[PDB]
Design a protein around this ligand. Sequence first.
Ligand SMILES: [Ca+2]
Ligand SMILES: [Ca+2]
Ligand SMILES: [Ca+2]
Ligand SMILES: [Ca+2]
Lengths: 156, 156, 156, 156
Amino acid sequence: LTSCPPLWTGFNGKCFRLFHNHLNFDNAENACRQFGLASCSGDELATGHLASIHSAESQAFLTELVKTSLPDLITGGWAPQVYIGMKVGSTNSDQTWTDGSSVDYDGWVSGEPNNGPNSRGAIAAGDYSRGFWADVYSNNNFKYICQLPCVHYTLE
Amino acid sequence: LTSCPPLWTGFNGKCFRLFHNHLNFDNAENACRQFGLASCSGDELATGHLASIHSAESQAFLTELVKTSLPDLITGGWAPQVYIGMKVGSTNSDQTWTDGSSVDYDGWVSGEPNNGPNSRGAIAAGDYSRGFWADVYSNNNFKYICQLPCVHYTLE
Amino acid sequence: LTSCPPLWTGFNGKCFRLFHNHLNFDNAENACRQFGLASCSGDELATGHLASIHSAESQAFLTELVKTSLPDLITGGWAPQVYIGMKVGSTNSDQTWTDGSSVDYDGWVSGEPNNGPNSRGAIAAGDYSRGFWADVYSNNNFKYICQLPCVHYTLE
Amino acid sequence: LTSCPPLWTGFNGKCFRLFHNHLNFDNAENACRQFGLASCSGDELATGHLASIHSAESQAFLTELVKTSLPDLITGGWAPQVYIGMKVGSTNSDQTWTDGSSVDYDGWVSGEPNNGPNSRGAIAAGDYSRGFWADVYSNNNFKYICQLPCVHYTLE
Ligand SMILES: [Ca+2]
Ligand SMILES: [Ca+2]
Ligand SMILES: [Ca+2]
Ligand SMILES: [Ca+2]
């Protein structure tokens, strides 16, 4: 059981919130960076980011976050699309996450990505894409998911 | 900082979730009672309920839960109305919460309750009622808020 | 990561404290029952008990609790012995835990139990018994370990 | 209710552990710095320190930590003295904490500090000093209290 600030909700040690106002990818990442983690002394230690996803389970959860938060927006197609922190560079195999975590989970819908270079990933909650990711263009305006800074104690 | 299951969200040691499917008051209380707290041994110890509210702060929070969860349904009136666990019996001063907690916080809108006997309270998130409660009829069908069983350690 | 009241310490969802004043088995279980879990409404829901142990890991932890809490009391023999909630009845195979959990872990030292009927188990932290359990007589007076009531949410 | 690693114990969002092996102030600060907080990505973000104390309530708690952890060492005098992260420079009014937090709580015993320049504070749990601090010399060898890195989410 995970501890998250009010209005956020937690799965495996990370804390998520779905934001409802449509922003393009950049400003969506930026919105997320307004959240942070500071030391009690006062120093800024880290920043929030667009959610990164690392497993079938993480992915199933964020799908449910979206599908139950937005049940009226669930179409038979791709829609709704919600941004996650996925960036796709020149080759389709230049996938990074904005938080700098590593792409160790593949949740693309069959055929995706395919609008590269410099596309961005989104949960596509429609009954077609069934939650799995689609890549879209950076200036598309959508709902987004943030994660608060991911952090653990080192006791070595 | 409160610990809540995934998809739920926490304020001051209680855990809340907003449900989107419209139910009448009874079945909304019931839906919440499907969630519980059991001992590790196996015995059911307690049940979830429609949220009860005990302070300006609790009430402000649930108001933001609804306002941010549902920004498209926010009218200039009273709507949207989301059920909480408030029951109003024969006199208007017979107010009880469904969890059995005590009515030590008055969050009614000016004029409310007024549809007694046997009306039920709802956060009315419209800009007019600004979150505060309205009493409506038990068979009206609305979105609801649950709280998971409320418990604390006794160390005496 | 587990959430426990101040002065207690947590491993896998349960909360432990080591108590320093020697009591016999009965009064040790009793001391633990002074701690409880109540609903916010006010009703007593459950009681603390002498710790029960369910795996190599739980057992390794409680061993470390004892060994690091009491490093001056660690002898080359059996001592120090700290009560856990283990009861041994008529046959040596009538092992129950006081919290009513089930005996699914065997942490007896080689040869133990062996002072039945109606002996009780204790972590024996000395370098000989290396933490594993010894059974001793009910009226022996020792330090003890409590656990706060064990509970989880049922979401089925 | 605070979330702490096993063997630690929490009060108001910070996590404390009492260590039993006597070290001088420097090495005691250092021992605490072996604990840290890193990002999931892998970067070291912050370090543990000797506990700092910021209120009557914090101080009451740490006093109970020491008094209940070491009931056999509690003399009618000052002893036992346990280090906290307090440093006293040239004037007696140059008090800093090792974590960098600010000295907004005065918990010195009547008359203390008095062994400056460059003395260090310790909870003096003896019945005389009743928990409050004493300044002692940096090369004295005592038990110490660590706190894990103190952090909170910034949501602004
Ligand atoms: Ca595409
Ligand atoms: Ca009304
Ligand atoms: Ca024996
Ligand atoms: Ca002094």
